[PDB]
Design an enzyme around this catalytic site. Structure first.
Site, PDB file in Angstrom:
ATOM      1  N   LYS A 202     -24.622  48.718  69.644  1.00 39.70           N
ATOM      2  CA  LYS A 202     -23.415  49.037  68.849  1.00 39.70           C
ATOM      3  C   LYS A 202     -23.652  50.066  67.711  1.00 39.70           C
ATOM      4  O   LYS A 202     -22.770  50.855  67.394  1.00 39.70           O
ATOM      5  CB  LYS A 202     -22.816  47.780  68.207  1.00 39.70           C
ATOM      6  CG  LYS A 202     -21.955  46.920  69.145  1.00 39.70           C
ATOM      7  CD  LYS A 202     -20.675  47.665  69.535  1.00 39.70           C
ATOM      8  CE  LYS A 202     -19.764  46.745  70.372  1.00 39.70           C
ATOM      9  NZ  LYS A 202     -20.384  46.251  71.614  1.00 39.70           N
TER      10      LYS A 202
ATOM     11  N   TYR B  32     -11.933  40.408  76.222  1.00 42.40           N
ATOM     12  CA  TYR B  32     -13.114  40.150  77.057  1.00 42.40           C
ATOM     13  C   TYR B  32     -13.442  38.678  77.039  1.00 42.40           C
ATOM     14  O   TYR B  32     -14.497  38.270  77.542  1.00 42.40           O
ATOM     15  CB  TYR B  32     -14.356  40.965  76.595  1.00 42.40           C
ATOM     16  CG  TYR B  32     -14.608  40.829  75.089  1.00 42.40           C
ATOM     17  CD1 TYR B  32     -15.308  39.729  74.562  1.00 42.40           C
ATOM     18  CD2 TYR B  32     -14.079  41.749  74.196  1.00 42.40           C
ATOM     19  CE1 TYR B  32     -15.503  39.567  73.136  1.00 42.40           C
ATOM     20  CE2 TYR B  32     -14.262  41.611  72.790  1.00 42.40           C
ATOM     21  CZ  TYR B  32     -14.967  40.536  72.283  1.00 42.40           C
ATOM     22  OH  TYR B  32     -15.110  40.452  70.908  1.00 42.40           O
TER      23      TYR B  32
ATOM     24  N   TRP C  82     -20.798  39.145  80.793  1.00 44.07           N
ATOM     25  CA  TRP C  82     -21.576  39.551  79.619  1.00 44.07           C
ATOM     26  C   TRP C  82     -21.848  38.230  78.901  1.00 44.07           C
ATOM     27  O   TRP C  82     -20.947  37.690  78.239  1.00 44.07           O
ATOM     28  CB  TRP C  82     -20.683  40.494  78.759  1.00 44.07           C
ATOM     29  CG  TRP C  82     -21.218  40.947  77.436  1.00 44.07           C
ATOM     30  CD1 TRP C  82     -21.824  40.182  76.459  1.00 44.07           C
ATOM     31  CD2 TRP C  82     -21.143  42.278  76.911  1.00 44.07           C
ATOM     32  NE1 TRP C  82     -22.143  40.965  75.374  1.00 44.07           N
ATOM     33  CE2 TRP C  82     -21.719  42.255  75.621  1.00 44.07           C
ATOM     34  CE3 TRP C  82     -20.622  43.483  77.400  1.00 44.07           C
ATOM     35  CZ2 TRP C  82     -21.835  43.411  74.826  1.00 44.07           C
ATOM     36  CZ3 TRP C  82     -20.703  44.630  76.591  1.00 44.07           C
ATOM     37  CH2 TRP C  82     -21.323  44.579  75.322  1.00 44.07           C
ATOM     38  N   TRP C  83     -23.057  37.676  79.006  1.00 42.79           N
ATOM     39  CA  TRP C  83     -23.314  36.395  78.347  1.00 42.79           C
ATOM     40  C   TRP C  83     -23.924  36.582  76.963  1.00 42.79           C
ATOM     41  O   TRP C  83     -25.029  37.139  76.824  1.00 42.79           O
ATOM     42  CB  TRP C  83     -24.197  35.508  79.239  1.00 42.79           C
ATOM     43  CG  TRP C  83     -24.324  34.098  78.785  1.00 42.79           C
ATOM     44  CD1 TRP C  83     -23.300  33.237  78.452  1.00 42.79           C
ATOM     45  CD2 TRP C  83     -25.536  33.348  78.636  1.00 42.79           C
ATOM     46  NE1 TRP C  83     -23.815  32.015  78.090  1.00 42.79           N
ATOM     47  CE2 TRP C  83     -25.177  32.059  78.198  1.00 42.79           C
ATOM     48  CE3 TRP C  83     -26.892  33.655  78.820  1.00 42.79           C
ATOM     49  CZ2 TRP C  83     -26.121  31.070  77.937  1.00 42.79           C
ATOM     50  CZ3 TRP C  83     -27.835  32.683  78.570  1.00 42.79           C
ATOM     51  CH2 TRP C  83     -27.444  31.399  78.140  1.00 42.79           C
ATOM     52  N   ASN C  84     -23.187  36.128  75.939  1.00 44.94           N
ATOM     53  CA  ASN C  84     -23.582  36.327  74.545  1.00 44.94           C
ATOM     54  C   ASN C  84     -24.590  35.308  74.035  1.00 44.94           C
ATOM     55  O   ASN C  84     -24.333  34.580  73.114  1.00 44.94           O
ATOM     56  CB  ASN C  84     -22.330  36.412  73.641  1.00 44.94           C
ATOM     57  CG  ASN C  84     -21.792  37.848  73.563  1.00 44.94           C
ATOM     58  OD1 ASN C  84     -22.581  38.815  73.500  1.00 44.94           O
ATOM     59  ND2 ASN C  84     -20.463  37.992  73.550  1.00 44.94           N
TER      60      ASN C  84
ATOM     61  N   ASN D 246     -26.812  39.409  76.628  1.00 48.35           N
ATOM     62  CA  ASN D 246     -26.875  40.167  75.372  1.00 48.35           C
ATOM     63  C   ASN D 246     -27.942  39.486  74.485  1.00 48.35           C
ATOM     64  O   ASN D 246     -27.784  38.330  74.079  1.00 48.35           O
ATOM     65  CB  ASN D 246     -25.485  40.188  74.698  1.00 48.35           C
ATOM     66  CG  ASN D 246     -25.402  41.154  73.525  1.00 48.35           C
ATOM     67  OD1 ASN D 246     -26.206  42.089  73.389  1.00 48.35           O
ATOM     68  ND2 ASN D 246     -24.419  40.944  72.677  1.00 48.35           N
TER      69      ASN D 246
ATOM     70  N   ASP E 251     -26.831  38.330  66.309  1.00 45.82           N
ATOM     71  CA  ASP E 251     -26.395  39.339  65.350  1.00 45.82           C
ATOM     72  C   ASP E 251     -25.326  38.811  64.369  1.00 45.82           C
ATOM     73  O   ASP E 251     -24.981  39.487  63.386  1.00 45.82           O
ATOM     74  CB  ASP E 251     -25.996  40.660  66.072  1.00 45.82           C
ATOM     75  CG  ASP E 251     -24.726  40.514  66.944  1.00 45.82           C
ATOM     76  OD1 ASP E 251     -24.054  39.485  66.845  1.00 45.82           O
ATOM     77  OD2 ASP E 251     -24.408  41.432  67.737  1.00 45.82           O
TER      78      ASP E 251
ATOM     79  N   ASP F 185     -13.804  45.234  70.782  1.00 46.99           N
ATOM     80  CA  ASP F 185     -13.829  45.299  69.308  1.00 46.99           C
ATOM     81  C   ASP F 185     -13.204  46.571  68.739  1.00 46.99           C
ATOM     82  O   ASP F 185     -13.750  47.183  67.826  1.00 46.99           O
ATOM     83  CB  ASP F 185     -15.229  45.107  68.787  1.00 46.99           C
ATOM     84  CG  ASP F 185     -15.796  43.748  69.191  1.00 46.99           C
ATOM     85  OD1 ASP F 185     -15.008  42.824  69.469  1.00 46.99           O
ATOM     86  OD2 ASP F 185     -17.012  43.624  69.249  1.00 46.99           O
TER      87      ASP F 185
ATOM     88  N   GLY G 167     -26.624  45.206  73.837  1.00 44.68           N
ATOM     89  CA  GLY G 167     -25.246  45.464  73.424  1.00 44.68           C
ATOM     90  C   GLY G 167     -24.910  44.865  72.063  1.00 44.68           C
ATOM     91  O   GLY G 167     -23.732  44.714  71.721  1.00 44.68           O
TER      92      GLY G 167
HETATM   93  C1  LIG Z   1     -18.365  42.051  74.367  1.00 44.30           C
HETATM   94  C2  LIG Z   1     -19.000  41.640  73.055  1.00 44.30           C
HETATM   95  O1  LIG Z   1     -19.422  40.506  72.887  1.00 44.30           O
HETATM   96  N1  LIG Z   1     -19.005  42.636  72.143  1.00 44.30           N
HETATM   97  C3  LIG Z   1     -19.557  42.513  70.801  1.00 44.30           C
HETATM   98  C4  LIG Z   1     -19.062  41.308  70.011  1.00 44.30           C
HETATM   99  N2  LIG Z   1     -17.858  41.233  69.443  1.00 44.30           N
HETATM  100  C5  LIG Z   1     -17.799  40.035  68.830  1.00 44.30           C
HETATM  101  C6  LIG Z   1     -16.694  39.589  68.103  1.00 44.30           C
HETATM  102  O2  LIG Z   1     -16.718  38.498  67.574  1.00 44.30           O
HETATM  103  N3  LIG Z   1     -15.657  40.457  67.983  1.00 44.30           N
HETATM  104  C7  LIG Z   1     -14.476  40.183  67.294  1.00 44.30           C
HETATM  105  C8  LIG Z   1     -13.932  38.892  67.365  1.00 44.30           C
HETATM  106  C9  LIG Z   1     -12.708  38.588  66.731  1.00 44.30           C
HETATM  107  C10 LIG Z   1     -11.999  39.573  66.052  1.00 44.30           C
HETATM  108  C11 LIG Z   1     -12.518  40.865  65.984  1.00 44.30           C
HETATM  109  C12 LIG Z   1     -13.746  41.162  66.605  1.00 44.30           C
HETATM  110  C13 LIG Z   1     -18.997  39.371  69.051  1.00 44.30           C
HETATM  111  N4  LIG Z   1     -19.779  40.180  69.844  1.00 44.30           N
HETATM  112  C14 LIG Z   1     -21.157  40.019  70.250  1.00 44.30           C
HETATM  113  C15 LIG Z   1     -21.891  38.941  69.430  1.00 44.30           C
HETATM  114  O3  LIG Z   1     -21.836  39.184  68.023  1.00 44.30           O
HETATM  115  C16 LIG Z   1     -21.679  41.462  69.871  1.00 44.30           C
HETATM  116  O4  LIG Z   1     -23.092  41.516  69.972  1.00 44.30           O
HETATM  117  C17 LIG Z   1     -21.094  42.512  70.866  1.00 44.30           C
HETATM  118  O5  LIG Z   1     -21.565  43.855  70.669  1.00 44.30           O
END
Ligand SMILES: CC(=O)N[C@H]1c2[nH]c(C(=O)Nc3ccccc3)c[n+]2[C@H](CO)[C@@H](O)[C@@H]1O
Length: 572
Positions: free
Chosen positions: A153, A269, A324-326, A359, A331, A230, A122
């Site tokens: 993504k 989330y 969902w463990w990051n 993840n 990335d 996101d 993911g």
């Molecule tokens: C559920 C989730 O973690 N979704 C995405 C995700 N989203 C974010 C954010 O940091 N998103 C974000 C945070 C604050 C403001 C806008 C977007 C991190 N991650 C993971 C780690 O980079 C990324 O791999 C993943 O696809």
């Protein structure tokens, strides 16, 4: 070991070196594994609860989904699942018991503590290759992970802009093969879609999403997910999200004969990005059909799951969250490898979690260290042993050079400072010597020797890993970091020679060598892994690089005091 560790194990101190009862009624995926082990009479009874082959043992089979009873003695071998997947799992434990055509005499009753266990592909970045994913699925089977959620993504048919379009033929036939391999390894292939950035809340987009799911279903896919992470704007509406998922449930998951998991990832989330004056999470919890899973990353975007944390979410979503463990996802720190142990998640909260998926990094083979450990944690958290499982993972992945990979991984653990505030311990074996040496210096010979030993071992490990051919894709992944890690160790060695500095000319030779080595590290950092986001190659950054950088500046200071000189003592 045995990995994951069984719920119940009794071992007698006898070893054993056939008739096959149940081969035509037992899970064919399990029977195949047995026959693959059995290139070579005493009874072997295989079957699921209900099968004629295992009637005598039905009291012994745990009444848990994916549970099994396994028995080895002089007279016979029993491999009996509560269900088809449980028989397959019996065989996966069997395969580990069998060492050099011999078995121990054992009785095992086993089942998982967490219902769904696996990996969500993911991340942002280059999605795993087809061959990497094929290897992953087999590994999941061996470690009793039952879930693979496909959601890279950057796959345009998963997210923006072409989630409404079927996969082209080549990609479709590839997905079809992934599904068949998953099936053979008892893994639910969960195909995720990520429509929220441009979805319209009208019948036309609703219908296009379902048509896409139908095409995936025709490729063999039997579990599905919808991700709303996101995104901004209208796609974030929790009432409409729940209506859509309830519609997918009622019109599709409850109409097909054989759909397994239906999962959603919410827009909020994690706790820290949840509006405390909003009603997003309670709306989902109240409106979402109770069989639909809701994912959650913990208290923060990147975090470990606590009792208080899982309580907070579960109260709101009115069901146990699907974690969902990051980690080890890298990335957002693409210049680091995250090869340390899996730790920080509460081991007493199994009942509070519907699922737990990791993840991973865009480096598929390197991710197996964490993936193996998450498999072990999620199956039997009560007996989760962080460090032993980490070592076990490494020995499984690279048995021909396990000590060398442990050395490299021990020092490639931390993320460095980052926008998510997430860090990991690194280099703790040498941290005592490092701090005791450097404090004195600015010293115990035992501490200097530890530092010396550590640099020597890092060089041995780097050169053996570079040339290892047992897992070539792993080595290809890590090679740039291995080069940088070797340079780090060489620089350490030359700095310790400056400390022991015998004369002025020798000290100046060491000094120039260190500078050359710094330049080469800079070269690697500027030419390898030049991605747009965190370009380069950082290694041993938590403890080791700072100790070398600080010791170099300290010895130089000391030299300039001594000889009224003005050598540059900078380190960057
Ligand atoms: C559920 C989730 O973690 N979704 C995405 C995700 N989203 C974010 C954010 O940091 N998103 C974000 C945070 C604050 C403001 C806008 C977007 C991190 N991650 C993971 C780690 O980079 C990324 O791999 C993943 O696809």
């Amino acid at each position: 070991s045995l990995q994951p560790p069984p719920q119940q194990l009794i071992v007698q101190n006898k070893t054993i070196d056939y008739q096959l009862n149940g081969g035509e009624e037992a899970n064919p995926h399990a029977v195949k594994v047995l026959k693959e082990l059995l290139s070579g009479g005493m009874l072997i009874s295989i079957g699921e609860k209900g099968d004629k082959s295992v009637r005598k043992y039905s009291r012994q089979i745990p009444d848990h989904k994916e549970g099994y009873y396994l028995s080895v003695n002089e007279k016979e071998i029993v491999l009996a699942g509560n269900d088809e997947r449980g028989t397959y799992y019996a065989l996966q434990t069997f395969a580990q018991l069998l060492k050099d055509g011999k078995l121990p005499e054992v009785e095992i009753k086993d089942y998982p503590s967490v219902r769904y266990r696996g990996v969500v592909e993911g991340f942002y970045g280059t999605p795993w290759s087809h061959q990497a994913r094929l290897s992953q699925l087999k590994f999941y089977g061996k470690n009793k992970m039952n879930t693979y959620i496909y959601g890279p993504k950057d796959d345009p048919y998963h997210s923006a802009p072409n989630w409404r379009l079927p996969y082209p033929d080549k990609e479709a036939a590839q997905l079809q093969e992934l599904v068949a391999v998953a099936n053979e390894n008892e893994v639910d292939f969960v195909w995720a879609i990520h429509p929220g950035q441009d979805i319209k809340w009208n019948k036309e987009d609703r219908d296009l999403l379902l048509a896409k799911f139908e095409k995936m279903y025709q490729l063999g896919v039997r579990s599905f997910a919808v991700f709303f992470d996101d995104i901004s704007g209208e796609g974030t509406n929790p009432q409409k999200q729940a209506e859509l998922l309830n519609y997918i449930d009622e019109k599709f998951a409850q109409v097909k004969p054989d759909i397994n998991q239906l999962v959603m990832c919410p827009t909020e989330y994690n706790k820290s990005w949840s509006n405390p004056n909003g009603n997003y999470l309670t709306t989902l919890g109240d409106k979402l059909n109770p069989s639909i899973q809701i994912m959650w990353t913990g208290d923060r975007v990147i975090s470990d799951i606590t009792r208080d944390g899982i309580s907070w979410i579960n109260e709101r979503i009115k069901r146990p969250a699907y974690i969902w463990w990051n980690f080890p996802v890298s990335d957002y720190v693409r210049d680091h490898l995250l090869l340390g142990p899996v730790y920080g998640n509460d081991t007493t909260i199994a009942k509070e979690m519907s699922g737990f998926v990791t993840n991973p990094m865009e480096h598929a083979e390197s991710s197996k260290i964490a993936i193996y450990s998450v498999a072990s944690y999620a199956w039997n958290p009560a007996k989760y042993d962080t460090w032993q499982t980490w070592k076990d993972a490494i020995r499984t992945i690279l048995p021909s050079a396990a000590e060398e990979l442990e050395c490299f991984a021990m020092h490639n653990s931390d993320l460095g400072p980052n926008g998510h505030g997430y860090r990991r311990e690194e280099s703790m074996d040498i941290q005592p010597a490092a701090e005791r040496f450097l404090k004195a210096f600015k010293y115990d010979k035992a501490d200097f020797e530890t530092l010396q030993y550590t640099f020597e071992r890092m060089k041995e490990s780097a050169d053996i890993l570079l040339m290892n051919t047992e897992n070539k894709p792993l080595i290809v992944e890590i090679t740039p970091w291995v080069h940088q890690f070797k340079l780090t160790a060489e620089m350490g060695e030359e700095v310790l020679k400056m400390v022991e500095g015998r004369n002025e000319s020798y000290f100046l030779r060491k000094y120039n060598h260190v500078k050359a080595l710094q330049q080469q590290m800079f070269y690697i950092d500027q030419t390898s892994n030049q991605n747009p986001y965190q370009p380069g190659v950082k290694t041993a950054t938590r403890v080791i690089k700072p100790l070398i950088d600080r010791t170099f500046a300290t010895v130089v200071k000391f030299f300039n005091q001594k000889f009224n000189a003005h050598l540059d003592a900078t380190t960057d």
